[model samples]
Target: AQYEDGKQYTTLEKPVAGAPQVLEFFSFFCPHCYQFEEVLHISDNVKKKLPEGVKMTKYHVNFMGGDLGKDLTQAWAVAMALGVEDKVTVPLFEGVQKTQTIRSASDIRDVFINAGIKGEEYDAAWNSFVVKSLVAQQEKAAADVQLRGVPAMFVNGKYQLNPQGMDTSNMDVFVQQYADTVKYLSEK
Candidate 1:
């Protein structure tokens, strides 16, 4: 499809400052997000195509329930702060999705343990006030932007992507298109 920038996507009312951004709004339990990680690879697929200076981030948005929502969100926030999202994200998804003994918060810690994170380090990252603060930041930012639901993506905070135009069959191409647009917008 010959996608045009303005025609394909709309700019955000309040965009993030500094370099361009690629923010993915998701949750651990969101089926569509799992499909995103399953059908589309985040690192090699999306993050890879981003040009230099474009920051890539993920926000765990949970509206499904109370405990489970907070659990996974804090888990992801802890993972990011520990500088181990790469090692933990996919495995966490794979483990829980496959029912490989990961059914709760403690089970989630097992994934970190497998990633070679010791109990002390895990405690520091998981129980830190910073992790809680980051989680709060996520909540505030998402709320301020009204960014709800899973698989919702944004570019530099302004342009929101609509998947129907992106190459659903090939995630790389889709991400490339996405990156190209951010670059295009940056140029203007």
Candidate 2:
């Protein structure tokens, strides 16, 4: 598979189930994450390359926005639950990174609101048990893994693939190798 423990990836101490899963730990406060998703569109690209049945999870890190981190994360969870990620992600990132206007939960909700999601629908998902649980899980995953930075990718729970130090000089080569590595680890 041309992968090594320390070079290409790192091992997690406490691994979770859900093989063929890709957990991306990121934050809207992170410009790198914004660039990764919005600019390079790496996540979507990788999604297309997956060998079917492999799902990707985006876990918003709660360490960045201070008191507002959880709220931002809640917004993310709500978007996921409502299946409006494609609608709200760009706006959310722009609100945080570009406009810098999202300071409260209400502001986060407005992003969804602007995206045509009804206030009631956002409220429903925002307060749902499933979204709450997912937010808690997202919070725990970052802390449990002792994540040091944003835009981190974990394949099949245990393998922390390092996308840095790779040949990203060319997008084609980078995405190809990155997805290939993720595909290989997803089977393990």
Candidate 3:
């Protein structure tokens, strides 16, 4: 930890973990996060590189400010409950940010249904108590952290990864940095 990358993160007053609970705070409506898809994948690209006991998950912000925000957030939680994240994540992002196809919950439902989630399964997941509970959890987290933006990551709820400031013209360096930082934090 000589040239500590420690200065990059903002420490929290009350973090949300015993072990490292890595979370990416984002939304389907956030353009910057959409552009960061490649950088985001690096977290998982080297998933095996992470230290034991580290957990990584995404947190969908309810800052969209209306029914759309609530609906999309609910949809995301439902997707999580259904374990259909891999199927909908990228396509959902592209559909909204690039293609502009997912304009509402219904549109996204069709997207999921098309992606192989059975209609009944989607209905059940969408309306499950688990989704409601998860949404409530995220809402409280967003509020607790005073979150005002997307593309931010939190480790153990205390420190922000601050990936935005990480400059690199190379992939190998980026990967090494990612593994070193995220994995190091998990171990710490």
Candidate 4:
């Protein structure tokens, strides 16, 4: 099938073997996304528990427009550029959720700086080609997939889980379903 426009894609650099690739579409400003963090962590743990081959990647959805969106986009880009996604992902998400102060790029930058990344490095990474490309790619995915909200998941470039497709009222179950979907697809 032809590639779907506006559909989120995996940011993985290479393909996996004997496992399906899982891509999570999320936004820092989303309350559900915040609540779904534990699910993601569980999924990560599951991947580690599984035999080698299963792969999971995360893509931050910049659906939030204006300053808040820009800050999140920059933060994600910087993390990716600095190769500190593991270092900054949970902290950044927690900072925004706990403090609710991620309204500006400076605020996001403060978190990055506190994470041991230099200010200049963060700025340059946010502006780098790789990060910009990923950001633009995500925008295209949002437009093509017609995303209704954050905390969506795509498996093996085929299946998609979102509010429109599933009952997301129970955050834990919703997240587990997503993880289960990934686990099943990865094995297929």
1-188 in candidate 2: lDDT tens per residue? 36877766778878866533788888899988988887678788778778877678888887787988878888888887888889998999999999999988989888899999999988989899999887888877777667879889988768888877578788778777877777777777
lDDT of 4 by residue, 16-71 (tens): 23323565677787777766663446446446544477566666776565568766
Summing lDDT over every window of 10 consecutive residues in candidate 4, give the lowest-scoring window: 1-10
**TM-score, cand. 4 vs. native:** 0.72
Tens digits of per-residue lDDT for model 3 on 1-188? 43255454556767665423777777878887676564446556546686666667777887763677678888889888988878888887888788888777898898898899999999898898988898987787777677888867777767766554455677567656755566666566
Better of 1 and 4 by lDDT: 1
Per-candidate clashes come to 1, 0, 0, 6
**Model 1 agreement with the true structure over 29-76: per-residue lDDT tens digits:** 677677777765643466554566767777776675467668778888
Considering only N, C-alpha and C atoms within 3 Å, which residue pairs clash in candidate 2?
Answer: none
Every candidate's lDDT:
0.71, 0.83, 0.73, 0.63
lDDT over C-alpha atoms for residue 19 of model 3: 26
Best by lDDT: 2
Model 1 spans with C-alpha error above 4 angstroms: 1-7, 13-20, 167-175, 185-188
Q: Whole-model lDDT for model 1 versus the true structure? A: 0.71
Q: CA RMSD for every model?
A: 3.0, 2.0, 2.5, 6.9
Rank order by lDDT, top first? 2, 3, 1, 4
Which regions of candidate 4 are displaced past 4 Å? 1-20, 38-42, 49-51, 162-178
Instruction: List where candidate 3 sits over 4 angstroms from the true fold.
Output: 1-6, 14-20, 38-40
| Model 2 poorest 10 in a row by lDDT | 12-21
Among all windows of 10 consecutive residues in model 3, the one with the lowest summed lDDT is 1-10
